[PDB]
Write an enzyme that holds these catalytic residues in place. Sequence first.
Site, PDB file in Angstrom:
ATOM      1  N   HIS B 162       0.809  -1.204   0.000  1.00 39.72           N
ATOM      2  CA  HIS B 162       0.000   0.000   0.000  1.00 39.72           C
ATOM      3  C   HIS B 162       0.855   1.273   0.000  1.00 39.72           C
ATOM      4  O   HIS B 162       2.020   1.254   0.407  1.00 39.72           O
ATOM      5  CB  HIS B 162      -0.931  -0.071   1.221  1.00 39.72           C
ATOM      6  CG  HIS B 162      -1.995   0.979   1.246  1.00 39.72           C
ATOM      7  ND1 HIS B 162      -1.809   2.212   1.830  1.00 39.72           N
ATOM      8  CD2 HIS B 162      -3.254   0.983   0.747  1.00 39.72           C
ATOM      9  CE1 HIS B 162      -2.909   2.931   1.691  1.00 39.72           C
ATOM     10  NE2 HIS B 162      -3.800   2.209   1.037  1.00 39.72           N
ATOM     11  N   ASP B 285     -11.276   1.420  -1.597  1.00 34.37           N
ATOM     12  CA  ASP B 285     -10.402   2.319  -0.846  1.00 34.37           C
ATOM     13  C   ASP B 285     -11.238   3.078   0.189  1.00 34.37           C
ATOM     14  O   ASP B 285     -10.867   4.165   0.647  1.00 34.37           O
ATOM     15  CB  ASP B 285      -9.649   3.308  -1.747  1.00 34.37           C
ATOM     16  CG  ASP B 285      -8.286   3.680  -1.175  1.00 34.37           C
ATOM     17  OD1 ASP B 285      -7.999   3.255  -0.034  1.00 34.37           O
ATOM     18  OD2 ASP B 285      -7.504   4.387  -1.852  1.00 34.37           O
TER      19      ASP B 285
END
EC number: 4.1.1.103
Lengths: 321, 324, 324, 325
Positions: B162, B285
């Site tokens: 990430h 997200d």
Amino acid sequence: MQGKVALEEHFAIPETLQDSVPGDYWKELQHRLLDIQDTRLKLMDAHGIETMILSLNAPAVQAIPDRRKAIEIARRANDVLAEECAKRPDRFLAFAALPLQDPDAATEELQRCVNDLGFVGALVNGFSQEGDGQTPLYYDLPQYRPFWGEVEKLDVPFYLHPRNPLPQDSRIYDGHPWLLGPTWAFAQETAVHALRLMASGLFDEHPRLNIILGHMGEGLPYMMWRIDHRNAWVKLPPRYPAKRRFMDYFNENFHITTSGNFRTQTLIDAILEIGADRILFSTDWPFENIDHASDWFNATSIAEADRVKIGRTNARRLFKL
Amino acid sequence: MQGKVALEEHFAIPETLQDSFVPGDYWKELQHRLLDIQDTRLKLMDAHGIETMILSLNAPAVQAIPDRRKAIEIARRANDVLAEECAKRPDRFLAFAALPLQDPDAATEELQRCVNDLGFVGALVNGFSQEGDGQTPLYYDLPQYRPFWGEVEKLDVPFYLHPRNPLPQDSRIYDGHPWLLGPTWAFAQETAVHALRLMASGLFDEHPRLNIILGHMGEGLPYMMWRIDHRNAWVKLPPRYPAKRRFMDYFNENFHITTSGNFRTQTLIDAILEIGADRILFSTDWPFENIDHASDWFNATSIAEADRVKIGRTNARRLFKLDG
Amino acid sequence: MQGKVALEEHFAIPETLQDSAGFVPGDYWKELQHRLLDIQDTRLKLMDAHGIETMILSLNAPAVQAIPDRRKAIEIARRANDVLAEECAKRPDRFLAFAALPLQDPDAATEELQRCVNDLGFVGALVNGFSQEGDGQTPLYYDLPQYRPFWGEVEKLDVPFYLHPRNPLPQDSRIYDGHPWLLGPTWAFAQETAVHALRLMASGLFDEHPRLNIILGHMGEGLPYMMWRIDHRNAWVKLPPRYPAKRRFMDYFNENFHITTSGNFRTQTLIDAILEIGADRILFSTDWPFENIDHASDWFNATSIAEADRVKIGRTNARRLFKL
Amino acid sequence: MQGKVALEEHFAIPETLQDSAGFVPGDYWKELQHRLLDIQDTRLKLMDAHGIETMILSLNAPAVQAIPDRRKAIEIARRANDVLAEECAKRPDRFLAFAALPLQDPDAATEELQRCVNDLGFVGALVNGFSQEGDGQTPLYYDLPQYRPFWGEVEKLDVPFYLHPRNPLPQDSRIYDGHPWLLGPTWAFAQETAVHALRLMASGLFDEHPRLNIILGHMGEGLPYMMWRIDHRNAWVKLPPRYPAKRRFMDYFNENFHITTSGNFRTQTLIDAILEIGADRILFSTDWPFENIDHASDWFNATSIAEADRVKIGRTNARRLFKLD
Ligand SMILES: O=C(O)c1c(O)cccc1O
Ligand SMILES: O=C(O)c1c(O)cccc1O
Ligand SMILES: O=C(O)c1c(O)cccc1O
Ligand SMILES: O=C(O)c1c(O)cccc1O
Ligand SMILES: [Zn+2]
Ligand SMILES: [Zn+2]
Ligand SMILES: [Zn+2]
Ligand SMILES: [Zn+2]
């Protein structure tokens, strides 16, 4: 396809030659950089390239900290280029090399190249270095606004070409020299520089500016939607000074070329993002083989009407040929 | 589409909440979203065809805690909290582990703990780690992390790489442009390069069964993948990086990308023609992106219905072994 | 997008109204009739609500092409054209017109086109495929010799010819026997129109009149997807084609044809067409009242193409083509 | 790419050779005949030079479908299948076979399919569109009631059915009158096959036999590009379709069909198909000897798709479909 225009085609002068491992390849690259009338022209003739807009190699002038010598080398490179183009004006055009470490001098040299030498634009290798040369100078800064105003006045395109970031700004690549240059570093450096120009509001002030990016936009098209639309639920106006969206300036003030990015999938994505009218054929010779670029472009999966525009008419229109 | 799986879905604990705008009424809403798991989030999942949500701690979180002991502490707490929240609705929530990678051995132990004891299905790390004075970004291609990767492969669970912002000393190119940091661009550059470092280091030659996941449609990689390997093709000299093969090989064989925060059909099409639909996964997200935004776009994006099923559900089911 | 131009937009006169009766269930017949007869009211409100500035109107189908008697055909054609000129005059800033032509009588059709263009200011012609004449048992295609003078006049007047669909005659429809649901817009319309277009190309018509502009609706009636095969099938046979035309089908299609989005609101189809004929030769259109204007506009406003192309396909291509 | 599988690869027996006569000019006829009759030599050499490991062979067209006499049709089909089995047995590691069927006699076709599959090891059937029977003046489509038993057996045997093209009968070809160059592979083949496939879908055949696998060559005979319109035309009319099938054409196409790249080496077309039916249902094929194998292979090796999909389309989709693993 015949009658193509290519505009990220480089050459070098002895002074900047070193700017570009030991062996037959380095020897060949040197020959290519110094040659204009022989090998280069013969390949153009064999690969349907009628017009080649030449530019000095990189980083060249942008890596010369002393503004005095930077102006000198720029002028020298531009005069050599003018001489070379004069030998076959029906085939060669030229981009000006500019000493941007000195805004006023840069503005003046651009005027000379355009009005006196007949150059059709400028090609700059990213940020400039000046003085101790430890600070990257980006063109979205205030001191460059007058320069941009003149670029818009002359009405000639500005090709924002790559260069590697300074060592102190390259830690992410430490231990990975193979990630610097055309592999990746070049794209990141150029894409962000382009974004800085957009975010600064430069195109609000000078909306007629024409910026060109090679290597199919340095990765911008694929991520353009996200650049503006990330966290869309947050309905607050963007914080940057520019009045509109990045996609607006990219769609209205930019053109991208196929230099060193002979990939059909990438071209299709670009056609569906910026449009075929703003994509131009280019090769990145001598760093890329002309036959590689031409063979790929001649057969890429697009409409023949678009192959004509991308390979020739878009450029002829842009440079008022 | 119903029955979707989403895997870049974040939450926070009081200790990491601050890592995640302006005084505007938006900050308040974001906080609520980050702290909520069983209420608002679940209702949106039920309204937008999401059956499985693989949760992960927010960012930078643990990767921004220079003191090893503290990092190990916060990670274990975030993972225990996550484990407890998933246990309340095991049929809807799965978990990714937070790891204190500023301490390779501790990180390996916590991953084993999470996977073997808590049933976590992978790990999500926000880029490089900070340790000691925290002034040096620690990338995972470094030698000291090889034992860790061997365990990741042994446990056979995916690693979601990430984003996180680069340290200031490494962000001069953005000076004067804070709006370019974060999801606008900096996140992608940072993550794309970290992924490339992993590839070039030969990590996947040593541990070929590793599965790395990247969000935001590959952080820009697909569009430029050809150039990454083929630039200056006339020069037939071999690359000098430790890796035995090319970047495209590792990308095509060891990576998967998600649609998190990148609801763009053109981008998805490019990815389909580069990495293949079998390697693309739906994700939103949330709470940084609205779940309805992600779902409405994906439900109608221009792809084959068969691929909508794979990208929206079956690719993830297979990857995380949810059918067996 | 606002200021769009739509050009496969139909209306009917009492004399041709019944031709559209068998294309919708009885429950929708009343509504379709209202739509076909309405030009100044609901149609304009829909245009205002869906960013359509210009609507180039045309009589419904098959209309004149289905009138076997020459005299009657000429009569109905003139009537429909006079009515159309009357309606456009009521809102000249929003409506333009395509001429209806009695092609069962070549000379008369040529005369009527001249009247429509020179006297009524029509911007082109729209014909529903082959014509029926006399016993009406033989489909008359326009690649036939007797139509050459007509085509010469079309090129001289320099106005586009929209080759619109119509169903094939029963004796030429056995493949659809037992499958009435395959006739019309489902499939038969495309086959009939695509082949008619190919006949024009193969006949060498465009060698003789290279300036002709032919328009096809429904994204080219299937042509783009198979265009490569049309010319390149059995490529190893290095011999010239057997047809009269001097060049390839792709040359005539690329040079003399334009396609519209009428009744084909599919992004994948649009992308294929863009990569085959190019955005410069694709035009927005709806096929109202057989298709809802909002369906067409909403899809086109969000389809996955460059904004520059949305402007061209939605407005500028048509303004260029019709010299507006 | 090596190890490819190709499945629209034709051959002929003396009895059906003349069927391919008119499809090529005079000077190329000698060459085409050589190609059609050859299996072990030229064909195999091209497979070795162009990365084709497996070739699923089929008789040429229209062949059996153009023999109106049931008895003669049955004979020719059986003879063609026996020769094919004989040829495959010479190199079983490289050649597989599609059965030729005398569908002008439903029961006979069903029995022959069983024979080819159960006793000859054939992996499917290839039929050149509608059949002619008796006076031969009526195209017999397979959505008709008399063929349901046959389809039930096809599903039971669980082998694919390749619906290959053929030209329509003269009385059903007036739209091409004066344009013989529009018949065949230029266009008529696609129209004829696309509609036949749509008839099967509309008939509800796939509701009754959902496990059927139908294959179409030439990238779906044009179907992918117009599939949305086929179902969604005049969408404002909120009334169910009139055909007997319970679902949409797109549903049956997506679930019961596979398309091959035979004679359609076009990247744009492949991309559209990938975004409509998906890479998992697209198969490499050449249409040899009507198309050069090198033409098909060179194009496919370089087409603009993910390498993972190149492997699937070029080999694994077929190996999976025909249970070769
Ligand atoms: O395009 C370039 O300018 C370039 C370089 O300057 C050095 C290496 C590769 C390259 O493409
Ligand atoms: O983790 C994320 O995905 C994220 C942030 O942590 C902050 C802003 C945007 C965003 O997408
Ligand atoms: O003319 C048309 O465009 C039309 C019809 O005449 C009947 C049904 C659908 C359609 O689009
Ligand atoms: O059967 C075929 O596949 C075929 C023919 O029978 C004739 C021409 C081309 C072709 O592909
Ligand atoms: Zn360059
Ligand atoms: Zn995230
Ligand atoms: Zn219409
Ligand atoms: Zn065939």
